[model samples]
Target: LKCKKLVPLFSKTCPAGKNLCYKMFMVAAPHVPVKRGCIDVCPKSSLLVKYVCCNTDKCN
Candidate 1:
């Protein structure tokens, strides 16, 4: 799907089995350059990251 990639304008697509979008961002410092991806590797949040996932095109 067309989700939030590096600059938001760029994104990746998913396959049939993995049809979800995932996004990871810095909790406070957005300057870290957040990136998103198609479903498959479900990423979890960490001390410096705030993970978010969703279903649908550009859902991330």
Candidate 2:
């Protein structure tokens, strides 16, 4: 989906029998880098940057 303003998304649960999860991210103004890809794992916590991950298929 195209975003016209800063958007926030948060989820804390995984589907039944599914371990994959995700978190949304974006910058408010000026210039922001749009990115997409897959990773092996996600950090449990962070202080300087925002991120999310899961353990099911294509959870990045």
Candidate 3:
């Protein structure tokens, strides 16, 4: 129920059905911004970035 969430954020409950926590980010290039959070789902990626999800907490 606890996971790291990036601003743009917090470490809170992932909500019901969103038990699958995740942390997705795009920070490969300086021009790119940072994005991370605890939620359900992972769709598409870019700017040399990737999306990840897991059943365990903080499994980004």
| lDDT for model 1 | 0.68
What is the lDDT for 15 in model 2?
35
Sorting all predicted structures by lDDT, with the top scorer first, yields 1, 3, 2
Stretch of 10 with least lDDT, candidate 2: 1-10
- Candidate closer to the true structure by TM-score (higher is better), 2 or 3: 3
Using TM-score, give the best candidate's number.
1
Q: Write the per-residue lDDT of candidate 1 for residues 1-60, one digit (tens) a residue.
A: 556555676656676666677776787776454676766657767887877678877777
lDDT for 34 (candidate 3): 67
Query: Which ranking of candidates, highest TM-score first?
Result: 1, 3, 2
TM-score of each: 0.62, 0.28, 0.59
Model 3 over residues 1-60: C-alpha lDDT tens digits? 776667534566577877786556566754443666665566666556767678876654
In candidate 1, how many clashes are counted?
0
Off by over 4 Å in 3: 7-10, 27-33
Q: List candidate 1 stretches off by more than 4 Å.
A: 1-4, 29-33
Q: How well does candidate 1 match the true structure in TM-score terms?
A: 0.62
Residue 41, candidate 3: alpha-carbon lDDT: 66
Spell out the clash pairs found in candidate 1. Answer: none
